[PDB]
Symmetry: C3
């Protein structure tokens, strides 16, 4: 059975096919690729943009999405094995996935890390459990990676540059400020897709403590070796932005501080200057800027940058609809 858990699991040819199908759906949004079919959108964490895009995507192709929210509509689910369920959990994931598989044709899963222990969050237990027990294809709607965002982002860039071939372009994945420590998911995904596309990627962050998990740094390294781009880590803003063709910002909590965020606060507060502003973008090669959203204005990026004609965040946002339709259509 084929699932859409990560772009890294798919071949370049398969990804290219998805992006092209996404482009086709953008030119003709109504169809019957999902006629009479259904997808269960399982939200362990809520998301209006994800619910909206998937729900409409199913509708437009003749299918139907069922929105489920485990944290609000049911007792906790047990994912561990060989336990005596005499605690808080009422049902095991094996039963949840097997039953859903008798009702729907696809299962989408969104489940964020708990931020107490990265060794546990990085195992992607919720998503992997659904993939293990489900008799139908599973789709990652964001856990510790955000593959749907990757393709929406990739498509937006190809559309902006007028070509699917982005090799050679200088790509800057920059950490930006936020009052709280966030999920590294979007950054892990950006690094992954940018290198898979063969761009010359620079991971710009305040200190070595903010470097992403080795797993993704390795995915990126492997992608560069295969696509012909490059991977570099930098803690210097000006040299990173210089000549950049693309600047993608995202804030995230330093991994070494999981379960110990108190001391991480004064650290991030020293880098509020990582905010994407006009000065920094002026250093780029008339590059574009984007963010996965939601974005705190004048904190992650200034109003001037956000409303600049070079900001493609709304186009990338729209593309979530098109790429997800391509993903669902491919899996059924």
């Amino acid at each position: 059975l084929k699932h859409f858990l990560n772009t890294q699991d798919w071949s370049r040819a398969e990804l290219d096919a998805l992006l092209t199908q996404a482009a086709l759906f953008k030119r003709n949004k109504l169809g019957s690729e999902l006629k009479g079919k259904s997808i269960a959108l399982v939200f362990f964490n809520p998301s209006m943009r994800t619910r909206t895009s998937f729900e409409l995507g199913a509708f437009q192709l003749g299918g139907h999405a069922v929105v489920l929210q485990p944290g609000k509509d049911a007792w906790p689910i047990e994912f561990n094995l060989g336990t005596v369920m005499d605690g808080d959990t009422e049902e095991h994931i094996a039963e949840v996935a097997r039953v859903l598989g008798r009702y729907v044709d696809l299962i989408g899963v969104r489940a964020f890390p708990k931020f107490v222990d990265w060794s546990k969050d990085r195992e992607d237990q919720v998503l992997k459990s659904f993939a293990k027990y489900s008799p139908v294809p599973v789709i990652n709607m964001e856990t510790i990676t955000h593959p749907c965002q990757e393709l929406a982002h990739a498509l937006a860039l190809q559309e902006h540059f007028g070509t699917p071939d982005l090799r050679g372009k200088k790509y800057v994945l920059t950490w930006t400020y936020h009052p709280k420590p966030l999920n590294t998911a979007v950054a892990n995904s950006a690094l992954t897709i940018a290198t898979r596309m063969g761009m010359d990627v620079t991971l710009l962050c305040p200190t070595p403590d903010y470097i992403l998990d080795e797993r993704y740094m390795d995915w990126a390294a492997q992608n560069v070796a295969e696509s012909g781009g490059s991977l570099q880590v930098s803690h210097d803003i000006d040299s990173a932005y210089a000549g950049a063709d693309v600047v993608y910002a995202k804030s995230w909590g330093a991994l070494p501080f999981f379960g110990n965020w108190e001391p991480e606060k004064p650290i991030r507060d020293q880098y509020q200057h990582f905010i994407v502003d006009e000065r920094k973008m002026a250093l780029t090669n008339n590059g574009v800027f984007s963010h996965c959203l939601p974005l705190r204005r004048n904190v992650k990026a200034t109003d001037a940058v956000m409303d600049s004609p070079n900001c493609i965040a709304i186009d990338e946002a729209e593309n979530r609809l098109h790429v997800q339709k391509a993903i669902m259509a491919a899996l059924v």
Copy 2:
């Protein structure tokens, strides 16, 4: 771009067209006016009747409604301008509306006042912000006015009297008791539509403190001058009910007491006798009674009045479905 924010913004001819289209949908509810189209129902405050009627209305015309609840599915949204978003708000309304506009064809918005400061609530910030930033038509699902209720009410009255011409009929908008101070929205709307229809309207309330906002009193005055009816405020129950053809009740908190409801409590408790009962209706010209619902029995109106053959509240309730379909069809 045309929106449905208030009936006052539409011409009499346009409103008449909406009501007539509503009558047509009532005679033939299934159609394709919204085939493949969608509407995002954004609830900042929940409403089962509104979600049900809009959702079914979209379905019956071949479209699809996406139900969103910002207060429960996402962090707070920022509506103010030029601020540094380092507080509770995670995303700005500009981004929320622009992205939704790339997904749906229509956006419905329900957002109640906060009851702390009327000078702030009366600005209709949430609704006006959506209207400002959305690239698609916006529909008021109740904020400080309830235009959808206005048309459902107007249609019910025309159906009851067997004519679209209600000029001359004596219309009594009466305040009624409730243990808590409520939104003036429905009353503002009733006054607006009743006068727009040229009826002889009387605003019956306990004291001058309960008179509606000047904005609506002026809308009403303007409507009478143009339609040929009349507007009058009264604090005397018997003279108001005398000869009435229509009695519409609604409870609301005295505007001068926003952010200071403690002293307003003993005041409203002195007017529990404003309850619509048989004695009062016996003074009318065999007039009809209605309420927007939900209604507390034997508090706002007695069981006898509510179950009287002259109570058309259920018919007005049904009409929410028909008028909203007319509104959505007109805006796409």
Copy 3:
């Protein structure tokens, strides 16, 4: 007007027709039996499996389900009669049902007992009120009985044995352990349908305190007299399981302890050995095992029993979809 409140209200011929229609829908799931029709799924208590199955069932037959959750989307509803609604309740059930009846073609209701007083919970007030005031058919989505589960269960058994005639088969409805006292609904329903099908039923429970309400014990007695089976209560595990063809487990709080669960805790904790394990099933006649779900593994039943090829719980779960479609189609 015909409703689906309990299987006991339907004739054997009618039930047989429902089960056969369910079998037909399983062979051809897409249809137009509900084309343009709708059902309001009213959840006073949430259920992902019920929302999913009903919602998809409506969709597959050309209809649409509207999901409503009174406890989270509105103030409390008043069910009592002749009261002055100056308390917590904002709207009366008469208005709720009458209005919904102007919007939808069917109304599903799920409302659990409150566990404080069984004399009150056993009156099925919420469901009976909807049935009384609704102008459209009402469907029990679980209150103090679970008729939809009954038919899904009945169908699974017929499919397992390869025949609709289960007379003579030894049916064991066994209480099982759970750390908390639960609803007797599923057990009441199992006893009801098993006897209606003419099986030789044994109600296995720890003590006389766990015997089900007299109402259902009488339904069962009447069913046996008419179908030709038998009804027996047992507190001895081994004699009950011996030669059993079917074992259906369910945990429930002892009725005599409603509103006084403290002393019931040490009592149930003495019967953890009621867990369905391999030893017990080894005593049966190669019988099947099932549970309505959700099931706590290694508490209600061991992993070995749950994953045994003789466990049909997932098939019974799937059948909720098919039988509910048969029910909705029959009522419209």
